A paper describes a structure:
We also determined a 1.14 Å crystal structure of a binary complex of Pum and a hb PRE2 RNA (5´-UGUACAUA), which exemplifies the modular 1 repeat:1 RNA base recognition of classical PUF proteins. For example, the UGU motif of the PRE is recognized by repeats R8 through R6. While the overall structure of Pum in the ternary complex is similar to that in the binary complex (RMSD of 1.2 Å over 324 Pum Cα atoms), the C-terminal region of Pum undergoes notable changes. Since the upstream nucleotides were not present in the binary complex, the change in the structure of the C-terminal region of Pum may be induced by the presence of the upstream RNA and/or Nos. With these conformational changes, Pum and Nos interact with one another and together recognize RNA immediately 5´ of the core PRE motif. Pum binds to the hb PRE2 using the base-omission mode observed for human Pumilio1, where bases +4 and +5 stack directly.
Pum is a founding member of the Pum/fem-3 mRNA-binding factor (FBF), or PUF family, of eukaryotic RBPs. Pum binds with high affinity to specific sequences in target mRNAs and represses protein expression and enhances mRNA degradation. Here, we report the crystal structures of Nos-Pum-RNA complexes, which reveal that Nos acts as a molecular clamp that embraces both Pum and RNA.
Numbering used by the authors: 1090 to 1426
RNA sequence: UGUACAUA
C-alpha cells in the first residue's frame, strides 16, 4: 500500500501553504516520510504549544517505532529539543526499559544521543543505568559506541564508574578497535583523574604495539596532545632510539611528529639529534620516504635554532638531488618557499 | 606527497 492522498498531494506541491493542524490523523504517516518528516521538523519550532500537543499526541502512540525509523527519528529528536518539560519527560518514559535496544539500532541511537544532550542530570542517569552490564557490547557496536561516547561527554563522571570498571583488562583490545578507540579518547578527556589513572597505567603496558596500530596510534597521539607531562614522557621513552624506523611507518610516523611537537625542550633535542647529530644517513633516508619526509618537515618547524642548523647541514648536500625524488622533492619545496 | 569517527 502507498502514501495517502494527503501525503502524496503534499509531496507533489499541491498544498504550498499546508500547516501542522492540516495533518490531523496523518502525523505518524508524515513522520515516516522523508518530506513529511522534514515538514514537521521545520514547523515544530515557530509553532504554538497547542500545535505541538496535537503532533505530540499522535507520535506518542507510535513513539518507539518512530525512534527507530529512518525519517521518524528526527521528529522525536525535535521534541527533545523543543518540547515542554512534560513532553520530554513523557518521551523519557517511552525510552525507559529500551535504552540498550535503541542504542544498538541505527536510528534509535540518534534518539538516545539527543536525549542525553537535552535532559536533566537525573534523567541522564536513568538512561546510563540501563547500559550497566552491556558496556563492551555497546562500545564495540557501530551504533552503540556513539551512545557510550555521548554518555562520557554529557554525564557526571561519578555515574560512569561502571564503564571504567568494564574497561579493566580490555584497554589494548579497545584501543586497537575501530569504535573502542573513540571511547578510550572520550574517557581521557572527560573522566576524573582517579578514573583515567587505571586506563593510562594499562595503556602503558602496550605502548609499543599501540604506536604502530591502525587505531591505537590515535590514542597515543591523544595523550601526546592532551595528556599530563608525565604520560607524554613515558610515551616518548618508547620512541627514543626508534625515530628512523617509526618515521617510515604509515601510522607511527604521526606519533613521531606528535612526540617532537609536544616534547619538553630536552626531549625534543634528543629525538631530533638522533637523526642528524651522527655521521649516518638517517635523515637522508627519511627525506626520501613517503611518510618520514613529513617527520623531517615537522622537525624543521619545531627545531630550536641549534637543531635547525644541524638539520640544514645534513640537508644541504642533498638539495640538488632531492628535487627529482618523489617524496624528497617536498623537502626542497619547503626550504625554497 | 600520509591513517579512524556513523542517519534523508
Amino acid at each position: 500500500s502507498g502514501r495517502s492522498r494527503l501525503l502524496e498531494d503534499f509531496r507533489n506541491q499541491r498544498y504550498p501553504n499546508l500547516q501542522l493542524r492540516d495533518l490531523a490523523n496523518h502525523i505518524v504517516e508524515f513522520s515516516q516520510d522523508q518530506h513529511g518528516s522534514r515538514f514537521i521538523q521545520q514547523k515544530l519550532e515557530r509553532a504554538t504549544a497547542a500545535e505541538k500537543q496535537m503532533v505530540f499526541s499522535e507520535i506518542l502512540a507510535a513513539a518507539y517505532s518512530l525512534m527507530t525509523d529512518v525519517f521518524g527519528n528526527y521528529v522525536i529528536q525535535k521534541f527533545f529539543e523543543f518540547g515542554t518539560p512534560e513532553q520530554k519527560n513523557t518521551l523519557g518514559m517511552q525510552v525507559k526499559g529500551h535504552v540498550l535496544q535503541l542504542a544498538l539500532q541505527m536510528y534509535g541511537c540518534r534518539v538516545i544521543q539527543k536525549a542525553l544532550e537535552s535532559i536533566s542530570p537525573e534523567q541522564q542517569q536513568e538512561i546510563v543505568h540501563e547500559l550497566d552490564g552491556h558496556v563492551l557490547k555497546c562500545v564495540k557496536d557501530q551504533n552503540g559506541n556513539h551512545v557510550v561516547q555521548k554518555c562520557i561527554e554529557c554525564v557526571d563522571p561519578v555515574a560512569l564508574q561502571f564503564i571504567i570498571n568494564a574497561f579493566k583488562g580490555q584497554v589494548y583490545s579497545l584501543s586497537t578497535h575501530p569504535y573502542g578507540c573513540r571511547v578510550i579518547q572520550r574517557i581521557l578527556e572527560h573522566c576524573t583523574a582517579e578514573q583515567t589513572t587505571p586506563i593510562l597505567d594499562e595503556l602503558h603496558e602496550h605502548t609499543e604495539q599501540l604506536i604502530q596500530d591502525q587505531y591505537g596510534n590515535y590514542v597515543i597521539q591523544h595523550v601526546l596532545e592532551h595528556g599530563k607531562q608525565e604520560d607524554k614522557s613515558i610515551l616518548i621513552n618508547s620512541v627514543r632510539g626508534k625515530v628512523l624506523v617509526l618515521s617510515q611507518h604509515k601510522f607511527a610516523s604521526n606519533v613521531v611528529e606528535k612526540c617532537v611537537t609536544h616534547a619538553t625542550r630536552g626531549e625534543r633535542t634528543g629525538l631530533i639529534d638522533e637523526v642528524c647529530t651522527f655521521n649516518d644517513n638517517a635523515l637522508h633516508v627519511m627525506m626520501k620516504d613517503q611518510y618520514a619526509n613529513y617527520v623531517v618537515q615537522k622537525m624543521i618547524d619545531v627545531s630550536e635554532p641549534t637543531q635547525l642548523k644541524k638539520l640544514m647541514t645534513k640537508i644541504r648536500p642533498h638539495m640538488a638531488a632531492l628535487r627529482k625524488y618523489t617524496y624528497g622533492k617536498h623537502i626542497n619545496a619547503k626550504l625554497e618557499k
